[PDB]
Amino acid sequence: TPSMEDYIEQIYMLIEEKGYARVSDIAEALAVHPSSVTKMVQKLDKDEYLIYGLVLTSKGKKIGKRLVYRHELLEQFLRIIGVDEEKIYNDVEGIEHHLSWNSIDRIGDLVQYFEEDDARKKDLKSIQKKTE
Amino acid sequence: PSMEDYIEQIYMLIEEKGYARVSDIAEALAVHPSSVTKMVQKLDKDEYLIYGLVLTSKGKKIGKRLVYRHELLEQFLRIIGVDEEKIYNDVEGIEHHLSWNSIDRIGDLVQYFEEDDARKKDLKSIQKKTE
Ligand SMILES: [Ca+2]
Ligand SMILES: [Ca+2]
Ligand SMILES: [Ca+2]
Ligand SMILES: [Ca+2]
Secondary structure (H helix, E strand, O other), X not given: OHHHHHHHHHHHHHHHHHOXXXXXXXXXXXXXXXXXXXXXXXXXXXXXXXXOOOEEOHHHHHHHHHHHHHHHHHHHHHHHOOOOHHHHHHHHHHHHHHOOHHHXXXXXXXXXXXXXXXXXXXXXXXXXXXXX | OHHHHHHHHHHHHHHHHOOOOHHHHHHHHOOOHHHHHHHHHHHHHOOOEXXXXXXXXXXXXXXXXXXXXXXXXXXXXXXXXXXXXXXXXXXXXXXXXXXXXXXXXHHHXXXXXXXXXXXXXXXXXXXXXXX
């Protein structure tokens, strides 16, 4: 499931970025072999996420948009609570697949909480100082 | 990640029962005792424990940090409003993919809400503003 999610998220991004998604671009972006991509694409095709360049069905597009959103939100989350920027991508890449929608939605409210009043960010930063 | 789950599980069993048997480990992790004997031999080789099953100081320190990590992540999701029943499965999944930096920052976040209940109330307000 996680792997399928990484493929769909990547395909969505490529289509939005280049207008198309090639097996070759998919393979490179995911650091995998084209044989693994072809196999995965056939599975996604079977499950109706896309059609074998390759075009996403409405189902793959809705899921892709959501996966990209999930990624972006999780990066903002760690960024806001002060995680070293260089560590953020790798952590989001691992946890993004293991968070229920309830957790994603709650994390979304947390981000909004800190975004609607900068004093709150200042208050959270102060705690980091005490901890130090 | 699997090694971390075994170490975390072994530390808890020893802390609760006073010892950790292969059968208790397999039962707690829902796996075959063969898979446990394999992992244990591996943890023994890496010096986290000695093949009853006794943790080395290395395994104890790691074991304790892992249990702390688990507890912390549950408190974090609990505090932001995640349905209690979904918390365990999510933590079990993300615990292995968070850097210590993120863990430490999540630690401050939890401290942030715990030191002033008024902040928890403002967070709840926003959750109700969602529309
Ligand atoms: Ca990923
Ligand atoms: Ca991602
Ligand atoms: Ca786990
Ligand atoms: Ca755990």
